[PDB]
Amino acid sequence: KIEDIGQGAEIIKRTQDITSKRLAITQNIQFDFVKDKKYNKDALVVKMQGFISSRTTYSDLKKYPYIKRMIWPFQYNISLKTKDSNVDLINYLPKNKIDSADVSQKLGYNISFNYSKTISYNQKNYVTEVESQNSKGVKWGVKANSFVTPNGQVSAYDQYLFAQDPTGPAARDYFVPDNQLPPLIQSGFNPSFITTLSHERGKGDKSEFEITYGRNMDATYAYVTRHRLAVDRKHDAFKNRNVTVKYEVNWKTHEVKIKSITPK
Amino acid sequence: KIEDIGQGAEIIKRTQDITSKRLAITQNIQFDFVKDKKYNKDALVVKMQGFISSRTTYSDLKKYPYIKRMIWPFQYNISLKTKDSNVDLINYLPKNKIDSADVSQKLGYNISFNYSKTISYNQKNYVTEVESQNSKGVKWGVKANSFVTPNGQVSAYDQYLFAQDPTGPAARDYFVPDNQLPPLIQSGFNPSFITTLSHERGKGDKSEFEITYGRNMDATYAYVTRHRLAVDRKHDAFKNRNVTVKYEVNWKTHEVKIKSITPK
Amino acid sequence: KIEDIGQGAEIIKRTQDITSKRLAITQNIQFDFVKDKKYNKDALVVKMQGFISSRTTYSDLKKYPYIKRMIWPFQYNISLKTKDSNVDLINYLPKNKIDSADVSQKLGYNISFNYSKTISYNQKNYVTEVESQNSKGVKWGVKANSFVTPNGQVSAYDQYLFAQDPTGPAARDYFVPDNQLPPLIQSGFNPSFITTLSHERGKGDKSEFEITYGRNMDATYAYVTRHRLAVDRKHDAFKNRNVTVKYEVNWKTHEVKIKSITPK
Amino acid sequence: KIEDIGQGAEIIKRTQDITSKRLAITQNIQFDFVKDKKYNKDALVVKMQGFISSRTTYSDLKKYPYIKRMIWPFQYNISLKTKDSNVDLINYLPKNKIDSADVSQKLGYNISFNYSKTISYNQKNYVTEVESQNSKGVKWGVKANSFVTPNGQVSAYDQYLFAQDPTGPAARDYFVPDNQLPPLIQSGFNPSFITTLSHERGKGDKSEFEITYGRNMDATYAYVTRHRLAVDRKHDAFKNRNVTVKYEVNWKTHEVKIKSITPK
Amino acid sequence: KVTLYKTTATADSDKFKISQILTFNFIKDKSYDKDTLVLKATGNINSGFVKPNPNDYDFSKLYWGAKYNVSISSQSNDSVNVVDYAPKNQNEEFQVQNTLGYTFGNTAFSETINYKQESYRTTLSRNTNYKNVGWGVEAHKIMNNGWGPYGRDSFHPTYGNELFLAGRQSSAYAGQNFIAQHQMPLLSRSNFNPEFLSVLSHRQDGAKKSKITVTYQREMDLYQIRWNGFYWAGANYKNFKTRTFKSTYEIDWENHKVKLLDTKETENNK
Amino acid sequence: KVTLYKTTATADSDKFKISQILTFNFIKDKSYDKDTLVLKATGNINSGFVKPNPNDYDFSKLYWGAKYNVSISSQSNDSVNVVDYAPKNQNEEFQVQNTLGYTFGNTAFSETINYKQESYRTTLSRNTNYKNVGWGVEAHKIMNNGWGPYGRDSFHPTYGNELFLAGRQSSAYAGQNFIAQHQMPLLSRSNFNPEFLSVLSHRQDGAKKSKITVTYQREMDLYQIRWNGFYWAGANYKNFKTRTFKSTYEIDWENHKVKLLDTKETENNK
Amino acid sequence: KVTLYKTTATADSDKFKISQILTFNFIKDKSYDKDTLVLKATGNINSGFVKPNPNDYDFSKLYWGAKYNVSISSQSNDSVNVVDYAPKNQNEEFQVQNTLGYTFGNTAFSETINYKQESYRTTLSRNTNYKNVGWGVEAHKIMNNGWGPYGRDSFHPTYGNELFLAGRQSSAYAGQNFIAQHQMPLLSRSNFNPEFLSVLSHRQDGAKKSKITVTYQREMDLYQIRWNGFYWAGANYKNFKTRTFKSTYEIDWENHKVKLLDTKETENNK
């Protein structure tokens, strides 16, 4: 039995690319109109791809230049939303999944009793979680998880993360070398999410979706004081730094255009 | 190098579902009439599926309420039987199979002799054994085998199985939490057995089979006495709690109709 | 690499089975005449299969009955020979092959200088070796190699092999139980060798091949003397105990017959 | 997703083999003219195969015969070059690639902190590196890397490599036995490189390429002095010992010829 | 071309609890000058386990199924020979990892053999001829718990065969000084479901009708324990009861149909 | 009925030893309202390694290739946008195994992170827009021998960056107190052969002719060592010399042919 | 279209126990301007093992087969060249794992090389030219038991080559101070069955008839042991006896048939 789902048939593909230079976020969205004869209504597979630059910046506090700061990206937020009643989300990917770990329990008796338990897991630098899903739209957020350091894995919520003994008066020197920074912090993030949106025929012709790509950036402030180094982290320093592109889809003429982008 | 049963050919499938709310046992049996041209007689692949709820119940004893009890399922019994000479069983699955274990024998001499033997096996929470097969019918019984606990595997025949230091005056508290109960005891069992029954053509038209699904439930009685916890197990407390559904198969009109069900 | 191998076309198969009850050797030889259009001459794939019973016999010595003996098979000899000049062997299987072992060399310095070398191999109870191959015929001999016993593997050339402290006055009791005897010694050996014999067309019509199956049996004599079990092994006690079936092949009428068999 | 030039289509293959007995180098080059309808210009896949004998020689020095020497091959140099403007290299293999190693970092506290790091890699006796690639020609050089010897692996740049305590007055005896010499030093090297050369149609008819196979041989001089074996290595003793074969390809008549070969 | 006219035949012995399910494929190929029939013998040979009586003070006995022999045969007068059969005998293999190590001293040498242990082993019968094939599933390495691997003929000087002995120095009625049915190997206390295959072949010029005799048999062993006053002992008496069910099935090569003719149930208690 | 027209274009810079081999596939499909071109940018960026001079007493320096940047771009006025590119950025993963032990005392813990280490890592350039894609292969974890992981910016208080320093307290001319060329990572002393992919797309209504600017560049770092009298110390000066070869290739979407127009070799020494 | 005409040719030397089974495939393709023939040389070069005599007091000797050389050649005057051949020479690889660990002190290091050891290694002959291809299977790492690897040229100062010596200080007749035939490598005491392949090619604009000379040769070595009065010692004398069988086979490219012409058995005892 299993299942089929909007598949096979014929696809007319239309691609739109926009770039916000002010926030360094690029939206390469491909809108593939599907026409399965077996499916009752109409369908559009929308693949969200692009580049959200990390915009990691190393500077010194203005009023107190002896204090240095690293604005590093914590969560890249990606979302698609619609206000049209006819359009409804029918399939979305990455979805939230339950997790499992391989465990081993050993009991021994060297006639001294011995007990040992090993739990094993596969961690990832950044984890993608479905923040909110309703029939109209879905939102995913790639929050940071764990990072490998020369001395064991460190949680992304540690205050002394990405900070080191100062090697010089330059701000970059108060923070770890680039060889110890994950690629997503050093360079940027490439989204790859897919959303199929069904639309009831006869009740509508045009429909507008607003796709948002963005970054919530945390900041670590570090300064050497009283024979010690003081690192502090302001969680969610700048939050909701996102770009929103509203795309108008004419289901009839299979044409997607771009209404407006904010921030322009 | 044997083709066997009815490879390919054509299958007319008929499905009958019955439920005994009194014993919480459901019988989803699919009867697929096979018409292999190469086969001399007629054949019916009968797939036994459904849900036998564990009916695990935790309650205090009537006379002495300070004594608590857990009726937990030990063996789920599944059987198909025919009282007609024409129909004969030609293939049945799961079949009783021999077992094997990987072994390793090491002998060392730190010029102090050393010897070590490791035997490794793959245990299952419940094991299915063919209790009795004759030409007319076959019976399988999924008896319990071994269960993982926080302190090493425990046999299903241990008296102190599924009992713990009382955490309160409630009966559920005298027994281990649901997080330490196998899914078959917590919820239920889904049978998946297949039986091909061949019938000699010319000497018969209608045939009736009784398919029995059931549960043999053991009970663990536990009570705190003189600063000790006394756990005792009555093996086969309630046995043969089964539901039998007689189905009348008309080989000619390819129609299966439920004659009668007991417990009605 | 780029080599088709004198096969890949229509095959007329003819099978002949003979059994010598005197020596308990059975010859199930299948002669498949191949007619590859691309091949210049004629060809016959001869598949040697059958059962050579171990004939393991545990009995006391005649003159001195206090001495017991086990006649156990050491080498099963299988051979195909042709005296006709036209027929020539073009392909034969199992062929003698070179062997390899995985090795690991570890050098360490706990600033002591530990060194360790592990050589790993895959042994077999009986090894098949091509004793002698010429254009007319080929001979293979499955000699014994190593046997797994409690307390380490033992070479098949050890004198104290298959002998144990006497558990009673019966001869079977002076030797290890059947649970510690390889299947080839307990029961028998099933050959599976393939020989393609090409024959130049125009010069011949009939050709006769003698196929020999056999057993070379070693004997272990054991007796308790001055309170010490004394085990001795007579290598090749009875040698060349073989059966020879001469089969006459008419290439023209694709018919194989049996000329004669010795031991009759 | 780039497909590739020469995919499917039709290939007219021409093979040319030449041998320089004076330097023991053989060039089995196969020139496969490809005619992809989709490709705009003409194309020729040139497969460089053959045998460069190691020419390892063990001999005593002339002036002082008590000093022995081993001329062993260090780098086998393989190169294809063209002077024709129209012909340009579009694909070459071996290609210089980045490397990776599996690493494991363990930190433990046996309440005594313990840290352990294991880096694992796969080494080859000789490594092929692209020395120089331009549009007209490409050069690869198989330099020596590491050799497994008893008592640990040894770099190919060690001075005491391939030398041993003298076992006799013969030169071969001052150096390790052949059982401890990699096959490339004991016998020779077989190149397997592929180069696709495109040629703009219309402005050309004939084209000439010089394919050079060669060997740079290092020498290890060893002599026993005052009870101490003294081993010394002259890196690049004889360098650029190569054979160049100029082949004239007529794209129109699909014919390759050998214009000239040096060493004659 | 090839045609596989398939048919099935079944025989039952309620007295000995032995059932025979025989499947047949009459492969007809022009390139073979003879007819071919593949017989897949499946079915059920019950172990015949007799539970030990729990009210036995010093001596108690159990009858456990230790060898199940299935044999397919053909009459000497016919042309029906047995060309192939499965499962055949096996040249078992094992993996060895000899290690030698020294510390510059503790010269140490270790050797590991990795193998596979089965509680029951199938081997050919030494009476397999051109007209009969047989298989015997015998008890091989049965482990009490972490004890053994014992078998039908193991022996310790003092305690004897300790196959199913619970405790050597325990204090219970002999009936309860055995391991429980659960720890005993599956085939020893439960049904044995054979899956054996034989290919038979009959010259086309031969008689249209032949007969084939398929035999399913169980060999039961008696395991008895006794209290000598100081320690428990045990003895396994092999082949004490042999329950055999043999059935003759007429094979019609002409119409490709198989019919069971006679059914003979035989008991050899000793 | 998808139709593909393949062609190739090549440009060379003998002075900077940089060669560009560009392969183009003009995929045309009715389902897409725009033309599509996949560009495979292969070729060769030489490392530019300058060997240390052996006759240097206390101070010596080498110039090693540390970052190679390849960027494919399009003009702002054209309709040619970059829809896809590879290799994209990676969310690297690692496997962790944690063990808790007890002896009845030695409560022990252990945590093992298994990962993969590379000498050079490719990441996208933060200037990747709808009309330009870039990649940068930077030196990551370079291991001296068993000493390391080091990089272009590691620092020890006393000995400084010890990336290519042979011995901290050795006694040789500075020219011979570096690790030999063989131990240095392949890309640092030898050619870097790029294999980058970019998909470009042009609206059919656009001009039949467009231009695309492909840039291959090398950033060389200077590693200098010095004898302070007591210990050797080292310093890596990043991006000392940048050799860049940029080439403009006219793409004709109408006739599906690509022609190199101009070749600009630029050198930025600091 | 490609047309493969296959044929076979065989030659035998009962005196030296050497048999040659040659299989030939005459592949004809329009895309090639030459004819092609794939020769697969199989057969049997007997080892020539001479058992040590057991009645030898202080000195005894065995002749063991150590190198088997198979060479397929063509005449210098013909146009038949050798394009491809297999098994080619191999760049053997090995896996190395290095561990560095400290206990906050027991700094420890460790290096493990995992490789594969074979008793005999096939390499090409340094006389492989455009008209001849040769392979040599030589003894490589022969292990006595856990004692070794040894070879045809190993040497210990006192005990000498101990390749096939049972005990250095044992007390038996020299004939019985050797390892038994069963512990010796298979190829050393039994037949060597070659499986080598060569692809010859001939310009269709050539003589319809050519000749090819296939040679199978064994190189026996003599291993002698002696009792110096205090310890046993051994010596391996290489290539003592060279038994060679060379056969010329006329290849007709026109009718695609191969006929053996002459057979030359040669002995080079030294």
Short mmCIF file of N, CA and C in Angstrom, two decimals, chain E residues 68-131:
data_model
loop_
_atom_site.label_atom_id
_atom_site.label_comp_id
_atom_site.label_asym_id
_atom_site.label_seq_id
_atom_site.Cartn_x
_atom_site.Cartn_y
_atom_site.Cartn_z
N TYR E 68 16.57 -36.42 14.18
CA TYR E 68 15.41 -36.56 13.28
C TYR E 68 15.96 -36.91 11.90
N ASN E 69 15.61 -38.08 11.37
CA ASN E 69 16.17 -38.54 10.08
C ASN E 69 15.09 -38.50 9.00
N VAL E 70 15.31 -37.75 7.92
CA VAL E 70 14.35 -37.71 6.78
C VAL E 70 15.04 -38.35 5.56
N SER E 71 14.41 -39.34 4.93
CA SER E 71 15.04 -40.05 3.79
C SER E 71 14.05 -40.22 2.63
N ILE E 72 14.44 -39.81 1.42
CA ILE E 72 13.57 -39.98 0.22
C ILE E 72 14.20 -41.10 -0.61
N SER E 73 13.43 -42.14 -0.95
CA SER E 73 14.03 -43.31 -1.64
C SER E 73 13.23 -43.67 -2.89
N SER E 74 13.81 -44.50 -3.76
CA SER E 74 13.09 -44.98 -4.97
C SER E 74 13.32 -46.49 -5.09
N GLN E 75 12.42 -47.21 -5.77
CA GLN E 75 12.54 -48.69 -5.82
C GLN E 75 13.66 -49.08 -6.78
N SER E 76 14.34 -50.20 -6.52
CA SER E 76 15.50 -50.61 -7.35
C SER E 76 15.04 -50.96 -8.77
N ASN E 77 13.81 -51.44 -8.93
CA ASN E 77 13.34 -51.90 -10.26
C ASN E 77 13.13 -50.72 -11.21
N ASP E 78 12.85 -49.52 -10.69
CA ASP E 78 12.51 -48.39 -11.60
C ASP E 78 13.75 -47.70 -12.15
N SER E 79 13.55 -46.74 -13.06
CA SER E 79 14.68 -46.01 -13.67
C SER E 79 14.81 -44.65 -12.97
N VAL E 80 14.06 -44.45 -11.89
CA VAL E 80 14.06 -43.14 -11.20
C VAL E 80 15.29 -43.04 -10.30
N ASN E 81 16.28 -42.24 -10.69
CA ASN E 81 17.52 -42.09 -9.90
C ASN E 81 17.50 -40.71 -9.24
N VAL E 82 18.31 -40.49 -8.21
CA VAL E 82 18.37 -39.17 -7.51
C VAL E 82 19.61 -38.41 -7.97
N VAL E 83 19.45 -37.43 -8.86
CA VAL E 83 20.61 -36.69 -9.43
C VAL E 83 21.19 -35.69 -8.43
N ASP E 84 20.36 -34.92 -7.73
CA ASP E 84 20.90 -33.86 -6.83
C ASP E 84 20.11 -33.81 -5.53
N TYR E 85 20.66 -33.15 -4.51
CA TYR E 85 20.01 -33.08 -3.18
C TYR E 85 20.54 -31.88 -2.40
N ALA E 86 19.77 -31.33 -1.46
CA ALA E 86 20.27 -30.21 -0.63
C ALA E 86 19.50 -30.19 0.69
N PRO E 87 20.13 -30.01 1.91
CA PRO E 87 21.48 -29.44 2.16
C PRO E 87 22.61 -30.48 2.11
N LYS E 88 23.64 -30.24 1.29
CA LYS E 88 24.78 -31.18 1.18
C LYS E 88 25.71 -31.05 2.40
N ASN E 89 26.77 -31.87 2.47
CA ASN E 89 27.74 -31.81 3.59
C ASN E 89 28.57 -30.53 3.44
N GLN E 90 29.15 -30.01 4.53
CA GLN E 90 29.86 -28.71 4.45
C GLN E 90 31.30 -28.80 4.95
N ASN E 91 32.25 -28.21 4.23
CA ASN E 91 33.67 -28.12 4.67
C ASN E 91 33.73 -26.87 5.53
N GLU E 92 33.37 -26.97 6.81
CA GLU E 92 33.28 -25.76 7.67
C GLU E 92 34.61 -25.01 7.73
N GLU E 93 34.56 -23.68 7.79
CA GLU E 93 35.78 -22.85 7.82
C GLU E 93 35.82 -22.04 9.11
N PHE E 94 36.99 -21.52 9.48
CA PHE E 94 37.13 -20.72 10.71
C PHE E 94 38.19 -19.66 10.48
N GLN E 95 38.26 -18.64 11.34
CA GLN E 95 39.22 -17.54 11.14
C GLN E 95 40.21 -17.53 12.31
N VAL E 96 41.51 -17.47 12.03
CA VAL E 96 42.55 -17.51 13.10
C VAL E 96 43.31 -16.19 13.09
N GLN E 97 43.69 -15.66 14.26
CA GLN E 97 44.41 -14.36 14.34
C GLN E 97 45.57 -14.48 15.32
N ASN E 98 46.63 -15.20 14.94
CA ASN E 98 47.81 -15.40 15.82
C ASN E 98 48.52 -14.07 16.03
N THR E 99 48.84 -13.71 17.27
CA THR E 99 49.54 -12.43 17.59
C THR E 99 50.80 -12.71 18.39
N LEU E 100 51.93 -12.11 18.02
CA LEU E 100 53.18 -12.27 18.81
C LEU E 100 53.65 -10.88 19.23
N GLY E 101 53.96 -10.66 20.50
CA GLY E 101 54.36 -9.31 20.95
C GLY E 101 55.42 -9.34 22.03
N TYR E 102 56.39 -8.43 21.98
CA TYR E 102 57.39 -8.36 23.07
C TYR E 102 57.54 -6.93 23.58
N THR E 103 57.91 -6.77 24.85
CA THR E 103 58.13 -5.42 25.43
C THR E 103 59.62 -5.28 25.77
N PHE E 104 60.35 -4.46 25.01
CA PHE E 104 61.82 -4.31 25.22
C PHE E 104 62.06 -3.63 26.56
N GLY E 105 61.17 -7.92 29.95
CA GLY E 105 60.61 -8.44 28.69
C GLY E 105 59.39 -9.29 28.94
N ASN E 106 58.38 -9.18 28.08
CA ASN E 106 57.18 -10.04 28.23
C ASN E 106 56.80 -10.58 26.86
N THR E 107 57.57 -11.53 26.32
CA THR E 107 57.18 -12.16 25.04
C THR E 107 55.84 -12.87 25.22
N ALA E 108 54.79 -12.41 24.53
CA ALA E 108 53.45 -13.00 24.71
C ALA E 108 52.92 -13.48 23.36
N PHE E 109 52.31 -14.67 23.33
CA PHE E 109 51.75 -15.21 22.07
C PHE E 109 50.29 -15.58 22.30
N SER E 110 49.37 -14.99 21.53
CA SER E 110 47.92 -15.27 21.68
C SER E 110 47.39 -15.84 20.37
N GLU E 111 46.39 -16.71 20.41
CA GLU E 111 45.81 -17.26 19.17
C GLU E 111 44.30 -17.35 19.31
N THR E 112 43.55 -16.72 18.41
CA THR E 112 42.07 -16.69 18.52
C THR E 112 41.42 -17.42 17.36
N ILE E 113 40.54 -18.38 17.62
CA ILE E 113 39.79 -19.05 16.53
C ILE E 113 38.35 -18.55 16.63
N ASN E 114 37.83 -17.96 15.55
CA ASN E 114 36.42 -17.49 15.53
C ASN E 114 35.60 -18.48 14.71
N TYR E 115 34.54 -19.05 15.27
CA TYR E 115 33.75 -20.07 14.55
C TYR E 115 32.26 -19.82 14.80
N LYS E 116 31.40 -20.77 14.43
CA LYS E 116 29.94 -20.62 14.68
C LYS E 116 29.43 -21.91 15.32
N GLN E 117 28.66 -21.82 16.41
CA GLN E 117 28.16 -23.02 17.15
C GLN E 117 26.68 -23.20 16.88
N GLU E 118 26.26 -24.40 16.47
CA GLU E 118 24.82 -24.68 16.23
C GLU E 118 24.38 -25.78 17.19
N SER E 119 23.17 -25.68 17.74
CA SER E 119 22.70 -26.69 18.72
C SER E 119 22.40 -28.00 18.00
N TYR E 120 22.13 -27.95 16.69
CA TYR E 120 21.80 -29.16 15.90
C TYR E 120 22.48 -29.06 14.54
N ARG E 121 23.01 -30.16 13.99
CA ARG E 121 23.79 -30.11 12.72
C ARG E 121 23.21 -31.10 11.72
N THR E 122 22.95 -30.66 10.49
CA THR E 122 22.40 -31.55 9.45
C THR E 122 23.54 -32.12 8.61
N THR E 123 23.57 -33.43 8.42
CA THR E 123 24.63 -34.10 7.64
C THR E 123 23.95 -35.12 6.74
N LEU E 124 24.62 -35.58 5.69
CA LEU E 124 24.03 -36.60 4.79
C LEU E 124 24.07 -37.94 5.51
N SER E 125 23.22 -38.88 5.10
CA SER E 125 23.27 -40.24 5.69
C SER E 125 24.26 -41.04 4.87
N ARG E 126 25.05 -41.90 5.52
CA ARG E 126 26.11 -42.64 4.80
C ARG E 126 25.48 -43.75 3.95
N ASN E 127 24.15 -43.76 3.85
CA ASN E 127 23.47 -44.76 3.00
C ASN E 127 22.87 -44.05 1.79
N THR E 128 23.40 -42.87 1.45
CA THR E 128 22.93 -42.13 0.25
C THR E 128 23.47 -42.85 -0.99
N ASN E 129 22.59 -43.35 -1.85
CA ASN E 129 23.05 -44.07 -3.06
C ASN E 129 22.44 -43.40 -4.29
N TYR E 130 22.50 -44.07 -5.44
CA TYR E 130 21.94 -43.49 -6.69
C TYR E 130 20.42 -43.49 -6.59
N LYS E 131 19.85 -44.24 -5.65
CA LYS E 131 18.37 -44.36 -5.60
C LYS E 131 17.82 -43.96 -4.23
#
